[PDB]
Amino acid sequence: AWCEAKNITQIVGHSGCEAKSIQNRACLGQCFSCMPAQSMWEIVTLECPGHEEVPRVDKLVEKILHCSCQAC
Numbered sequence: 001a002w003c004e005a006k007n008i009t010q011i012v013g014h015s016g017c018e019a020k021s022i023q024n025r026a027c028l029g030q031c032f033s034c035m036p037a038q039s040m041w042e043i044v045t046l047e048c049p050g051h052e053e054v055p056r057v058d059k060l061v062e063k064i065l066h067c068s069c070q071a072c
Protein backbone atom coordinates (compact mmCIF):
# COMPACT_ATOMS: atom_id res chain seq x y z
CA ALA A 1 0.00 0.00 0.00
CA TRP A 2 1.15 3.53 -0.79
CA CYS A 3 -0.32 7.01 -0.93
CA GLU A 4 1.32 10.33 -1.78
CA ALA A 5 0.28 13.99 -2.18
CA LYS A 6 1.47 15.03 -5.66
CA ASN A 7 1.96 18.63 -6.78
CA ILE A 8 -0.67 19.89 -9.22
CA THR A 9 -1.78 23.12 -10.75
CA GLN A 10 -5.44 24.03 -10.13
CA ILE A 11 -7.91 26.66 -11.35
CA VAL A 12 -9.44 29.00 -8.78
CA GLY A 13 -12.44 30.71 -10.40
CA HIS A 14 -15.60 32.60 -9.53
CA SER A 15 -18.59 33.80 -11.56
CA GLY A 16 -17.84 37.21 -13.13
CA CYS A 17 -14.10 37.19 -12.21
CA GLU A 18 -10.77 36.27 -13.83
CA ALA A 19 -9.69 32.74 -12.84
CA LYS A 20 -6.23 32.24 -11.37
CA SER A 21 -4.15 29.10 -11.19
CA ILE A 22 -2.31 28.07 -8.00
CA GLN A 23 -0.16 25.19 -6.72
CA ASN A 24 -2.05 22.52 -4.78
CA ARG A 25 -1.64 18.76 -4.25
CA ALA A 26 -3.71 15.75 -5.20
CA CYS A 27 -3.80 12.33 -3.53
CA LEU A 28 -2.42 9.45 -5.57
CA GLY A 29 -2.10 5.93 -4.23
CA GLN A 30 -3.01 2.28 -4.09
CA CYS A 31 -4.45 1.23 -0.71
CA PHE A 32 -4.56 -2.58 -0.26
CA SER A 33 -8.67 4.91 -0.13
CA CYS A 34 -5.87 7.50 -0.54
CA MET A 35 -7.27 10.71 1.01
CA PRO A 36 -6.00 14.00 2.48
CA ALA A 37 -4.18 13.50 5.82
CA GLN A 38 -3.07 17.11 6.42
CA SER A 39 -4.52 20.29 4.96
CA MET A 40 -4.57 24.05 5.46
CA TRP A 41 -6.28 27.11 3.98
CA GLU A 42 -5.25 29.97 1.74
CA ILE A 43 -6.92 33.18 0.61
CA VAL A 44 -6.86 33.65 -3.19
CA THR A 45 -7.83 37.10 -4.50
CA LEU A 46 -9.51 37.08 -7.93
CA GLU A 47 -9.75 40.26 -10.02
CA CYS A 48 -13.24 41.00 -11.42
CA PRO A 49 -12.80 43.46 -14.31
CA GLY A 50 -15.99 45.18 -15.50
CA HIS A 51 -17.44 45.22 -11.97
CA GLU A 52 -16.43 48.67 -10.63
CA GLU A 53 -18.17 48.40 -7.22
CA VAL A 54 -16.81 44.91 -6.33
CA PRO A 55 -13.59 44.81 -8.41
CA ARG A 56 -12.16 41.76 -6.62
CA VAL A 57 -13.19 38.81 -4.44
CA ASP A 58 -11.29 36.63 -1.97
CA LYS A 59 -11.86 32.90 -2.39
CA LEU A 60 -10.92 30.54 0.43
CA VAL A 61 -9.09 27.47 -0.86
CA GLU A 62 -8.15 24.27 0.96
CA LYS A 63 -4.54 23.24 0.27
CA ILE A 64 -3.68 19.52 0.57
CA LEU A 65 -0.28 18.93 2.20
CA HIS A 66 -0.15 15.14 2.77
CA CYS A 67 -2.26 12.09 1.99
CA SER A 68 -2.61 8.67 3.57
CA CYS A 69 -4.50 5.42 3.19
CA GLN A 70 -7.68 5.77 5.25
CA ALA A 71 -10.96 3.83 5.57
CA CYS A 72 -13.54 4.55 2.81
Ligand SMILES: *[C@@H]1O[C@H](CO)[C@@H](O)[C@H](O)[C@H]1NC(C)=O
Pocket residue numbers: 007023
Ligand atom coordinates in the same frame (compact mmCIF):
# COMPACT_ATOMS: atom_id res chain seq x y z
C1 LIG B 1 5.85 20.61 -4.42
O1 LIG B 1 5.47 21.97 -4.13
C2 LIG B 1 6.24 22.68 -3.15
C3 LIG B 1 5.67 24.10 -3.02
O2 LIG B 1 6.57 25.13 -3.49
C4 LIG B 1 7.72 22.60 -3.53
O3 LIG B 1 8.53 23.29 -2.56
C5 LIG B 1 8.14 21.14 -3.59
O4 LIG B 1 9.54 21.00 -3.82
C6 LIG B 1 7.34 20.48 -4.70
N1 LIG B 1 7.69 19.07 -4.82
C7 LIG B 1 8.23 18.52 -5.91
C8 LIG B 1 8.51 17.05 -5.83
O5 LIG B 1 8.50 19.15 -6.92
